[PDB]
Amino acid sequence: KTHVQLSLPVLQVRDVLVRGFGDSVEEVLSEARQHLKDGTCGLVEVEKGVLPQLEQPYVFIKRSDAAPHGHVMVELVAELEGIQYGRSGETLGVLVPHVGEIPVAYRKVLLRK
Numbered sequence: 001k002t003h004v005q006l007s008l009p010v011l012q013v014r015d016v017l018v019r020g021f022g023d024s025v026e027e028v029l030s031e032a033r034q035h036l037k038d039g040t041c042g043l044v045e046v047e048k049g050v051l052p053q054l055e056q057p058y059v060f061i062k063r064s065d066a067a068p069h070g071h072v073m074v075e076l077v078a079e080l081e082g083i084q085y086g087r088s089g090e091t092l093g094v095l096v097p098h099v100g101e102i103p104v105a106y107r108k109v110l111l112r113k
Contacts, residue, residue: 004111005071006036008043009103011096013053016044018097020055025078025085028057032076032095036111042098043107046091056080059095061109062088071110 021031035041043061044050051058061074076095077086092107 002113003073004036004113005069005108006039006111007106007108008041008093008095009098009101010093010105010107011042011044011098011101011103013044013050015101016042016054016096017099017101019053020057021059021095021097022057025057025080028059029076029078029085031097032059033113035097036095040098042096042101042103043093044096045093051094054094054096060091061093061095061111062086062091064089064112068110071108073110073112075112 021028057078057080060077062077064075065073075088077088
């Protein structure tokens with residue numbers, strides 16, 4: 001399908017054990033998409049102090065519509081030293097690998113695949 005319905009667990013930044021997806025804009029995007037397919041991708045909400053606790057390159061999910069079945073449509077946008085690869089809307093959080101951390105919530109989204 002073009003879009004997948006996912007429910008990502010929301011992790012508090014200081015609980016994340018793996019804090020990036022890779023070392024290049026194209027690997028962080030590829031793993032992110034891969035862990036999304038596998039249900040092993042988490043979501044950290046971006047607040048004051050949150051991004052410097054994480055490793056670049058960043059992968060954000062950003063909203064791309066104004067939202068079916070409760071799920072919000074989103075797309076991936078990487079970032080590395082201030083340059084973003086991907087134009088899209090408002091950031092719903094930063095993606096991270098999920099490796100068992102207990103979430104504080106679940107953000108329902110609809111991924112462009």
